[PDB]
A paper describes a structure:
Using cryo-EM we generated structural models of the full-length AMC011 Env trimer bound to either the PGT145 Fab or the PGT151 Fab.
We generated structures of the full-length AMC011 trimer bound to PGT151 or PGT145 Fab by single particle cryo-EM at resolutions of ~4.2 Å and ~5.7 Å, respectively. The detergent exchange from DDM to DOPC:CHS of the full-length Env trimer sample led to the generation of homogeneously shaped bicelles, which surround the transmembrane domains of the Env protein and increased the stability of the full-length Env trimer, as shown by an elevation of the midpoint of thermal denaturation (Tm) from ~56.1°C to ~63.1°C, reaching similar stability levels as soluble AMC011 SOSIP.664 (Tm value of 61.8°C). Reconstitution of the full-length Env trimer bound to PGT145 in DOPC:CHS led to the formation of similarly homogeneous shaped bicelles and also increased thermostability (Tm value of ~60.4°C). Finally, negative stain (NS)-EM reconstructions of the trimer Fab complexes in DOPC:CHS showed that both bNAbs PGT151 and PGT145 bound to the full-length Env trimer in an asymmetric manner as previously described, with two and one Fab per trimer, respectively. We compared the structure of the full-length AMC011 Env trimer in complex with PGT151 with that of JR-FL Env in complex with the same antibody, Both structures were similar to previous Env structures. The glycans belonging to the PGT151 epitope were ordered, and branched complex glycans at positions N611 and N637 in gp41 were resolved, as observed in Lee et al., 2016. Notably, PGT145, and to a far lesser extent PG16, binding to PGT151 purified full length trimer was lower than expected and therefore did not fit the overall trend. The presence of the PGT151 bound to the trimer therefore appears to impact the binding of these quaternary specific (PGT145) or quaternary preferring (PG16) bnAbs.
Numbering used by the authors:
A (entry chain G): 2 to 135
B (entry chain I): 2 to 27, 27A, 27B, 27C, 27D, 27E, 28 to 105
C (entry chain D): 512 to 547, 572 to 664
D (entry chain B): 522 to 664
E (entry chain F): 512 to 557, 571 to 574, 576 to 659
F (entry chain C): 31 to 136, 150 to 309, 312 to 322, 322A, 323 to 354, 356 to 396, 413 to 457, 465 to 506
G (entry chain E): 53 to 58, 65 to 103
Write the structure that this text describes.
Amino acid sequence: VQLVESGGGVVQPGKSVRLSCVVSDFPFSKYPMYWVRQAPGKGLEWVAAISGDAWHVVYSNSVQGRFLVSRDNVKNTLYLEMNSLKIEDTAVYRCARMFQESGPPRLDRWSGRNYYYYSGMDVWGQGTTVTVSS
Amino acid sequence: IVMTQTPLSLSVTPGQPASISCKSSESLRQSNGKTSLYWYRQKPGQSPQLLVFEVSNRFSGVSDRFVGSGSGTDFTLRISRVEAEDVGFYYCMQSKDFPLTFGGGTKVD
Amino acid sequence: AVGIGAVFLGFLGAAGSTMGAASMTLTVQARLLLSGGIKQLQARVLAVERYLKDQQLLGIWGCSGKLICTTAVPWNTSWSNKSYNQIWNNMTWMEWEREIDNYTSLIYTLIEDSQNQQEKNEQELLELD
Amino acid sequence: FLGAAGSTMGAASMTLTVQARLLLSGIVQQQNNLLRAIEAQQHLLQLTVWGIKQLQARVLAVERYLKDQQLLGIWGCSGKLICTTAVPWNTSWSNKSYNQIWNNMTWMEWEREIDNYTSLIYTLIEDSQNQQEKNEQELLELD
Amino acid sequence: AVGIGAVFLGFLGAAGSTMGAASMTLTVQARLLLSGIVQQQNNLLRWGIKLQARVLAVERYLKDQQLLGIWGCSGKLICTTAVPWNTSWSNKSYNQIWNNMTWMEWEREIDNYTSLIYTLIEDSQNQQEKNEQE
Amino acid sequence: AEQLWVTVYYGVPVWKEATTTLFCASDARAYDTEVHNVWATHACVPTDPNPQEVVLENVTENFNMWKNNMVEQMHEDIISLWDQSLKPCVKLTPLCVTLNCTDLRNEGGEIKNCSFNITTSMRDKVQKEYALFYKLDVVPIKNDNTSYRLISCNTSVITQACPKVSFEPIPIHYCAPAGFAILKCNDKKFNGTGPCTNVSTVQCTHGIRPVVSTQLLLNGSLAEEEVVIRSANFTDNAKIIIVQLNKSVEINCTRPNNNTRKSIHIGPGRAFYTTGEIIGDIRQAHCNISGTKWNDTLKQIVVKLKEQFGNKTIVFNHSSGGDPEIVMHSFNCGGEFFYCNSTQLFNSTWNTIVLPCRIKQIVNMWQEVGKAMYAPPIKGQIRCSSNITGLILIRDTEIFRPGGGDMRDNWRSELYKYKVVKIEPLGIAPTKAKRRVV
Amino acid sequence: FCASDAVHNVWATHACVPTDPNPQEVVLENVTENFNMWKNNMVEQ
Ligand SMILES: *[C@@H]1O[C@H](CO[C@@H]2O[C@@H](C)[C@@H](O)[C@@H](O)[C@@H]2O)[C@@H](O[C@@H]2O[C@H](CO)[C@@H](O[C@@H]3O[C@H](CO[C@H]4O[C@H](CO[C@@H]5O[C@H](CO)[C@@H](O[C@@H]6O[C@H](CO)[C@H](O)[C@H](O)[C@H]6O)[C@H](O)[C@H]5NC(C)=O)[C@@H](O)[C@H](O)[C@@H]4O[C@@H]4O[C@H](CO)[C@@H](O[C@@H]5O[C@H](CO)[C@H](O)[C@H](O)[C@H]5O)[C@H](O)[C@H]4NC(C)=O)[C@@H](O)[C@H](O[C@H]4O[C@H](CO)[C@@H](O)[C@H](O)[C@@H]4O)[C@@H]3O)[C@H](O)[C@H]2NC(C)=O)[C@H](O)[C@H]1NC(C)=O
Ligand SMILES: *[C@@H]1O[C@H](CO[C@@H]2O[C@@H](C)[C@@H](O)[C@@H](O)[C@@H]2O)[C@@H](O[C@@H]2O[C@H](CO)[C@@H](O[C@@H]3O[C@H](CO[C@H]4O[C@H](CO)[C@@H](O)[C@H](O)[C@@H]4O)[C@@H](O)[C@H](O[C@H]4O[C@H](CO)[C@@H](O[C@@H]5O[C@H](CO)[C@@H](O)[C@H](O)[C@H]5NC(C)=O)[C@H](O)[C@@H]4O[C@@H]4O[C@H](CO)[C@@H](O[C@@H]5O[C@H](CO)[C@H](O)[C@H](O)[C@H]5O)[C@H](O)[C@H]4NC(C)=O)[C@@H]3O)[C@H](O)[C@H]2NC(C)=O)[C@H](O)[C@H]1NC(C)=O
Ligand SMILES: *[C@@H]1O[C@H](CO[C@@H]2O[C@@H](C)[C@@H](O)[C@@H](O)[C@@H]2O)[C@@H](O[C@@H]2O[C@H](CO)[C@@H](O[C@@H]3O[C@H](CO[C@H]4O[C@H](CO[C@@H]5O[C@H](CO)[C@@H](O[C@@H]6O[C@H](CO)[C@H](O)[C@H](O)[C@H]6O)[C@H](O)[C@H]5NC(C)=O)[C@@H](O)[C@H](O)[C@@H]4O)[C@@H](O)[C@H](O[C@H]4O[C@H](CO)[C@@H](O)[C@H](O)[C@@H]4O)[C@@H]3O)[C@H](O)[C@H]2NC(C)=O)[C@H](O)[C@H]1NC(C)=O
Ligand SMILES: *[C@@H]1O[C@H](CO)[C@@H](O[C@@H]2O[C@H](CO)[C@@H](O[C@@H]3O[C@H](CO[C@H]4O[C@H](CO)[C@@H](O)[C@H](O)[C@@H]4O)[C@@H](O)[C@H](O[C@H]4O[C@H](CO)[C@@H](O)[C@H](O)[C@@H]4O)[C@@H]3O)[C@H](O)[C@H]2NC(C)=O)[C@H](O)[C@H]1NC(C)=O
Ligand SMILES: *[C@@H]1O[C@H](CO)[C@@H](O[C@@H]2O[C@H](CO)[C@@H](O)[C@H](O)[C@H]2NC(C)=O)[C@H](O)[C@H]1NC(C)=O
Ligand SMILES: *[C@@H]1O[C@H](CO)[C@@H](O[C@@H]2O[C@H](CO)[C@@H](O)[C@H](O)[C@H]2NC(C)=O)[C@H](O)[C@H]1NC(C)=O
Ligand SMILES: *[C@@H]1O[C@H](CO)[C@@H](O[C@@H]2O[C@H](CO)[C@@H](O)[C@H](O)[C@H]2NC(C)=O)[C@H](O)[C@H]1NC(C)=O
Ligand SMILES: *[C@@H]1O[C@H](CO[C@@H]2O[C@@H](C)[C@@H](O)[C@@H](O)[C@@H]2O)[C@@H](O)[C@H](O)[C@H]1NC(C)=O
Ligand SMILES: *[C@@H]1O[C@H](CO[C@@H]2O[C@@H](C)[C@@H](O)[C@@H](O)[C@@H]2O)[C@@H](O)[C@H](O)[C@H]1NC(C)=O
Ligand SMILES: *[C@@H]1O[C@H](CO)[C@@H](O)[C@H](O)[C@H]1NC(C)=O
Ligand SMILES: *[C@@H]1O[C@H](CO)[C@@H](O)[C@H](O)[C@H]1NC(C)=O
Ligand SMILES: *[C@@H]1O[C@H](CO)[C@@H](O)[C@H](O)[C@H]1NC(C)=O
Ligand SMILES: *[C@@H]1O[C@H](CO)[C@@H](O)[C@H](O)[C@H]1NC(C)=O
Ligand SMILES: *[C@@H]1O[C@H](CO)[C@@H](O)[C@H](O)[C@H]1NC(C)=O
Ligand SMILES: *[C@@H]1O[C@H](CO)[C@@H](O)[C@H](O)[C@H]1NC(C)=O
Ligand SMILES: *[C@@H]1O[C@H](CO)[C@@H](O)[C@H](O)[C@H]1NC(C)=O
Ligand SMILES: *[C@@H]1O[C@H](CO)[C@@H](O)[C@H](O)[C@H]1NC(C)=O
C-alpha cells in the first residue's frame, strides 16, 4: 500500500533530525521494518531493522550508536532519528517493509534465548533525502 | 560477508537472451531449508521493485522469462529474450545475516 | 539473521552456582534428560534405560512426580562434618557429589526399608476404625 | 480416541469423562498381546526385515509415551486428566474472547493458533509454579 | 577384602517367609527387576540379538506401571481398594495362610482366577471412582 | 540443636566422566541425485545443527587432550565407513597375471602399458588387453625378460571402490545423545592438559572435515593470532609435535595429464576400469606452493618453538626412514591420491616452490595391513587449491623432522577441546524439613 | 549372556563381554524347588 516519509531536508554537521514513515493498511505490529540508504551514483547500504514487537534492533556498523529507530504500532508510524551527522550521510533514505510475514519470537528449548527472524524487502517507500553540508 | 557480481554493463537491444550472475563469498543456505538471495530491480529515479524474492519463486506482475538458479555459492539470474524495458540496474541482495549487503547493480542499456 | 540474549536459564547453567541458587533451576535439567548405522538405536535405549532407573527409585521412596520431597530419615552427622550454612550457601553440587559418594549406597537402603517400606505396614493398619 | 475431532472444545469435555476414551487402556490391552511370545516361540527364526521394523516400532511406542508422562509428571499434574495451574493466561498469546475458544471452535485449528506460543507456555508452567511451589512448600515445613 | 553377614535381606531373600513377613523386602525385589546391576561396562569394541532382550525388560516394566496406573496405585507398593473378596476364588481364611504360608503357594492357589481379578480391580475401583469425581 | 532429615532432589546438575557412543550428524544438502558421498553415507543423520552454547562461568573441569576417547571413536568409525563401502564393489583377485610391458611414447613413472589374458565373466576364452600402469605397483619378476606382476597379490584381497561414490570430505558435526553434554574449553591459552576457566556446553561440535593426509593437515581449523604448539611430554624425544599456526598457507597441486575414460573387461555384472589414454603429451604432476610465505612461516614457528628452553639452537630437518609412502607427503585430491616429495620444505633456520609429486594406483588401506582400496580417476585434469593449518614433527641443533603415522593426531588437533560427561541427575541433601507422618 | 574373564581369542571379547569382577550368592531359607538336567535349556544354549 501507500508508503512515504516526511521530515527530510538539509542540515549541518553535528545536528539531529528524525524522519517519519507512515504505512497505510496492513497490520503494522505483525511486520518488521528496515532502513536502506542509496548513495547518489552508488549501490545500496543497509541501515537498520526493528522487530515486529519493537524489541529487537540491529544497526549497521558505520552508523552504529549514532542513529535511532522506533515504532508505534497504534499510530502506524516509523521513525528514524539520527545524531552526530556527517557529510557522507547525504543520500536517499527509504522506508521498507519485509516481504514475508514474521512470527512471534521462538524460544529454543535448550537455551532460554528467543529468536526474531529477519528476511528481506518488497515495498520500498519513495523516501526523503537528508543533506549534511554548510 | 562479501557478495559482489558481474558484469557491470550490458548495453543491449531487445530480442536475445542473456543472464546476470552474482558471486558469493560466504555460502548461503539457512537452516529453514532455503537460500536467502533476493534479486530485484530499480528504474532510474525510482525506488526499486521486487523481481523475484527467492531464486526459485517469483513475484506478482512478473513475466515468465525471468528465471534464476544457483548453488550455495554460485548464483545466477537468467533473462530469456531480454525485453525492451529492461533498463536501469539489477541488484543482488542476500539475507544471510547482518549486515546484509548488496551488489553494485548491473547496468543494462 | 536472528539473536537475543538469555532470558530464563541455560542447560547445566547452575552447575557452578550454589545450592540455594541451583534449587530454583532443576526443571531445565529435568526436561532435556530424555528427548535430545545401528549405533543411534543403541543410544536410544540406554537413554531410556537410565531414565527409568532414576524414575523408579523416586517411585519407591514415596516421592514420584515431585521434583523435591522430604522423608523422615534422620541425617547422620557422621556422614558430613560440614556446617549447615556452608552447604546451602557455599558448596556447589558438583563438589558435593564427590563428598558423599561413598555413603550413597547406605542412603538408598536407609530410605526404602527404613521408612517407605515401614510407612505402608503402618499405613495399611490404620484402618478397622 | 478421536471420536470428537469435529466437536467443539466446550462440548468435547463432556465425552472426555471416559478416560480420554480409555486412551492408555488401548495400549495395555495391546502390549499384553503384542507380548505374545510367538516371537520367543521362534526367536523370529532369523533376523528379518519385519523384526528390524518392529524393533524400531516398539521404541517409538516407548519414547513418545514417556514424553507425555514426564511433562505431565513435571507439571504437578501426574496421572490426572483435567488439572488447573497457577499460571495467569496472557492475552498477548490469544486475543480471542472466552466463548469463541470454547463454544465456537474445533481443536486442531486451535493447535495452529498457539503452536507458535506453545513452547513458551511449557517453561512458564514449571519455573513459575512447579519449580516454585516446592521451595515454598519446603519453607512451610521448616516450622 | 572381607564381608560381614547381611542385615538387610538381599535379593529374593524372604522367599521362605510368611506373607506377613516377606512384605518387608518388597522394595529390594522391585528395584532390581529393571536391568539388574548394570553389566556391559562400555566395551563396544569389535549383531542384533543382544538388543531385543533389553527392549523386552522395559516392556515388562512398563506393563506393570501402567497397570498400577489404571488401578489407581502408581508410586505405591501396598494399596487398598473398595473390592470385597469372593470366596469362590479361595475360601481359605485369614490366619490359615497369612502366618502359615509363603508366596509361591499363594500364587498356586489363585493362578486360575488371575485375569478374573484384574477386570474387577479395573472396573469397581477406578472406572467406578471415575463416576464419583463430579 | 534441631534434628535434620534427608531431602531428595531431582535434576541436580552434576556429572562424572563417561565414555559413550556419539553419532554422526552431517550436512544434509545435495546428498540426493548421485551423491554417494562415502563420508556422508547419503547424509548419515540429516540434522544440519544449530550449535547453541551456554556459558557456565563458575566451572573448572580438568581436561586432557591426550586421554580423550572421541579421537578413538573416529578411527573406529572411519575404517568402518570404508568397510561397508568396500564390500559391494568389484573384487580384483583374478587379475594377478604375468605381463609383457613396453615403453610408452609421450624419469620413472608411466612408461609401461601392459597386456595379459583373462576370462572373467564369460568363463570360456581368455583375452589379452591393454591398460595404463604407473610405477609403485609393479614388480619385474624373476627368470623372465621384462615381465611384471602387481605388488600386492599375495596379501589379502584387492577390492576397488565403485565410481558412484565420492571421498569428498564434508564437515561432520558430532552431536551428543540424551543425558550427555559435550563440553568445550573457552581459554585459547589452553596448552593441551590441565584445567580450564569458564568451560561452556554445546549440543554439537564444530566443523570437522575428516581429511586424510600425512606430514601436514590440509583443510584444517586454526587458532587465534598466536602460534600454539602442543605435545605430550614435549621433552621426550619419541613423541609427536602438534603444530597450530595462526595463519593459512595456500597450496596448489595439479595433475596436468589429460587422463580419460576407458573400458576394461567385465566381471560378473562388474565393469572394471583401468585408466584410459592421456591426450598425447605428459606433464608430471606437482604441488606448487607460494614459497615466500612458507619461507616466512618457519621463522615464525621458532618464535613459539623456543620459549621452553634457552634462546639457542633451533633447526629444521627433513624426514627419513623406509619406503617412500611414509617418506613422501601423502594426501588425496578429489578421488585421487598423491605422494609428494617434501624434502625442500625443511631447511634449517637460526635465531614459488614446485614439488615433484608421485601418484600410484594400488593404494593400501590407511592403517590395516591386508586389504587395499583402488580407484582410477575421472576424465580431464585435476586441480585442488587447499590450505595448511598444521604439520607433524618429531624430536631427535635440536633436530626437528616431519614425522607422522597417525591422523588420530590430526584428529587430536581437531578435538583438543572436548569432553563428554553423563548427567547423574539424582541427588540428596539434608535440611530441617520432614515428611508429614500420621 | 556370556561373561568371560580376561589376545585375539575367539572367546575373549568377540563372543563375550570382558572380565568378571565377582560372583555373588544369596542362600534361601525355607524353599523347595524341583530341578531337571534333561529338560534344561542352558545345556541347549
Ligand atoms: C550414624 O550411623 C552409625 C552407623 O553407621 C555405621 O557407620 C557407617 C560409617 C557405616 O560403617 C555403617 O555400615 C555403620 O552401620 C550409628 O552408630 C552405630 O550405633 C549402633 C548402636 O546400636 C552401634 O552398634 C553397637 O555395636 C557394638 C559393636 O558390636 C560388635 O562388637 C561386639 C563386641 O564388642 C567388643 O567387645 C570387646 C571385648 O570387651 C571390646 O574390646 C575391649 O575394648 C576396650 C575399648 O573399647 C578396650 O580396648 C579393652 O581392652 C578391650 O578388651 C571391643 O571394644 C568391643 N567393640 C565395640 C565396638 O564396643 C559384639 O558383641 C557385636 O556382636 C559386634 O561384634 C561383631 O560381630 C560381627 C558379626 O555380627 C563380627 O564380624 C564377623 O567377623 C568374622 C571374622 O572375625 C567374619 O568375617 C564374619 O563374616 C563377620 O561377620 C565381628 O567380628 C564382631 N566384632 C567384635 C569386635 O566382636 C555392639 O556391641 C553394641 O551392642 C551393645 O549396645 C547395645 C545398645 O542398645 C546393647 O543393647 C547391647 O546389649 C550391647 O551392650 C551395639 O549394637 C554401632 O557400632 C554404631 N556404628 C558406628 C559408631 O559406626 C549412629 O548411631 C548414627 N547416628 C545417628 C544420629 O543415627
Ligand atoms: C507461527 O510462525 C510461523 C513462522 O514460524 C514458523 O514456525 C516457527 C516455530 C519456526 O520454526 C519458523 O522457522 C517457522 O517458519 C508463521 O508462519 C508465517 O505465516 C504467514 C501467514 O500468517 C506467512 O505469510 C505469508 O507469506 C506469503 C509468502 O510466503 C510463502 O512462502 C512461505 C515459505 O516459502 C509459505 O510458508 C507461505 O505459505 C507462502 O507460500 C506472503 O506473500 C504473504 O503476504 C501477502 O499476503 C498477505 C495476505 O493478503 C498480505 O497482507 C495484506 O496486505 C494488504 C496490503 O497492505 C493489507 O491491506 C491487508 O490488510 C493484509 N492482510 C490481509 C489478511 O489481506 C501481504 O501484504 C502480502 O500481500 C501481497 O502483497 C504484495 C505486495 O503488495 C502484492 O503484490 C502486488 O500485486 C499487485 C497485483 O499483482 C501489483 O502487481 C503490485 O505491484 C504487487 O506488489 C500481493 O498481491 C499481495 N497478496 C495478497 C493476497 O494480499 C503472507 O504474509 C509466512 O510466510 C509464514 N512464514 C514465516 C517464516 O513467517 C505463522 O503465522 C505463525 N502463526 C501464527 C498464528 O502467528
Ligand atoms: C504478556 O506478554 C507481553 C509480551 O510478551 C513478549 O512476547 C512474548 C512472545 C515473549 O517473547 C515475551 O518474553 C515478551 O516479553 C509481555 O510484555 C512484556 O512486558 C515486559 C515487562 O516485564 C516488557 O519489558 C519492558 O521493556 C521495555 C523496553 O525495553 C527495551 O527498550 C529499552 C529502551 O527503550 C527504548 O527507548 C527509546 C527511547 O528513545 C524508545 O524510542 C522512542 O520510541 C518512541 C515510540 O516509538 C518514539 O518513536 C521516539 O521517537 C523514540 O525515541 C524506544 O521505543 C524504547 N523501546 C521500546 C520497546 O519501547 C532497552 O533498554 C531494553 O534493552 C529493551 O530493548 C522497558 O522500557 C521496560 O522497563 C521499564 O518498565 C519497568 C516496568 O514497567 C520499570 O520497572 C522500569 O524501571 C522501566 O521503566 C521493561 O523492561 C516487554 O517489553 C513486554 N513485551 C513487549 C513485546 O513489549 C507482558 O508482560 C505479558 N503479560 C504479563 C501479565 O506478564
Ligand atoms: C580443501 O578445500 C578446498 C575448498 O574448500 C577444496 O577444493 C575444492 O575441491 C573440490 C573437490 O575436487 C573441487 O570440486 C571439483 O570441481 C571441478 C571443477 O568444476 C568447475 O566447473 C563446474 C561447471 O559447472 C562449476 O560448477 C564448478 O563450480 C567449477 O567451477 C569439478 O569438475 C569436479 O566435479 C567432478 O566430479 C563429479 C563427481 O561426479 C563429476 O560428475 C564431474 O563430471 C567432475 O568430473 C569437482 O566438483 C573444487 O573445485 C575445489 N575448489 C577449488 C579448487 O577452489 C579442496 O579439495 C580441499 N582439500 C582437499 C585436500 O581435498
Ligand atoms: C558465579 O559466581 C559468582 C561469584 O563468584 C556469582 O555472583 C554472585 O551472584 C549473587 C547473586 O546476585 C550476588 O549476590 C553476589 O554478589 C555475586 N558475587 C559477587 C562476587 O559479586 C554468580 O551468581 C555465579 N553464577 C551463577 C549463574 O550463579
Ligand atoms: C525357616 O525355618 C526355621 C525353622 O523351621 C524358622 O525358624 C523358626 O520358625 C518359626 C516359624 O515356624 C518362627 O516362629 C520362629 O521365630 C523361628 N525361630 C527363630 C529363632 O526366630 C525360620 O524362621 C524360617 N524362616 C522364616 C523366614 O520364617
Ligand atoms: C569466558 O567467558 C566469556 C563470556 O562470558 C567468553 O567470551 C566469549 O568469547 C567468544 C569467542 O569469540 C565470543 O564469540 C563470545 O561473544 C564471548 N562472549 C560474550 C558474552 O561476548 C570467553 O571466551 C571465555 N574465556 C575466557 C578465557 O575469557
Ligand atoms: C463459529 O461459528 C460461526 C457461526 O456463528 C457466528 O459466531 C459469532 C462468533 C459471530 O462471528 C457471528 O458472525 C455468527 O453468529 C462461524 O461463522 C465461525 O466460522 C465459527 N468459528 C470460529 C469463530 O472460530
Ligand atoms: C609375495 O611373494 C613375494 C615373492 O615373489 C617373488 O619374489 C620377488 C622378489 C619378485 O621377484 C616377485 O616377482 C616374485 O614372484 C615376496 O617377496 C613377498 O614378500 C610376498 N608378499 C607377502 C607374503 O605379503
Ligand atoms: C462371585 O460371587 C458371585 C455372587 O456375588 C457368584 O455368583 C459367583 O459365582 C462368584 N464367582 C465365581 C467365579 O464363582
Ligand atoms: C632381454 O631382451 C633383450 C632384447 O630382446 C636382450 O638384449 C637381453 O639379453 C634379454 N635378457 C635376457 C634374455 O635375460
Ligand atoms: C619427559 O622427558 C623424559 C622422557 O619421558 C622423562 O625422563 C621425563 O620424566 C618426562 N617428564 C614427564 C613425563 O613429566
Ligand atoms: C594458487 O592458485 C590461485 C589461483 O590463481 C592463486 O591465487 C594462488 O596464489 C596460487 N598459490 C600459489 C601459486 O602458491
Ligand atoms: C600471527 O599472525 C600475525 C599476522 O596475522 C603475525 O604478525 C604474527 O607474527 C603471527 N604469530 C606468530 C607467532 O608468528
Ligand atoms: C637435517 O637432518 C638430515 C637428516 O634428517 C641431515 O642429513 C642433515 O644434515 C640435517 N641438517 C642440519 C643442518 O642439521
Ligand atoms: C607451478 O609453478 C611454476 C613455477 O613456479 C609455474 O611456471 C607454473 O605456472 C605453476 N603452475 C600452477 C598450476 O600453479
Ligand atoms: C585458505 O586460505 C585463504 C587465505 O586467505 C582463506 O581465505 C581461505 O578461507 C582458506 N580456505 C578455507 C577452506 O578456509
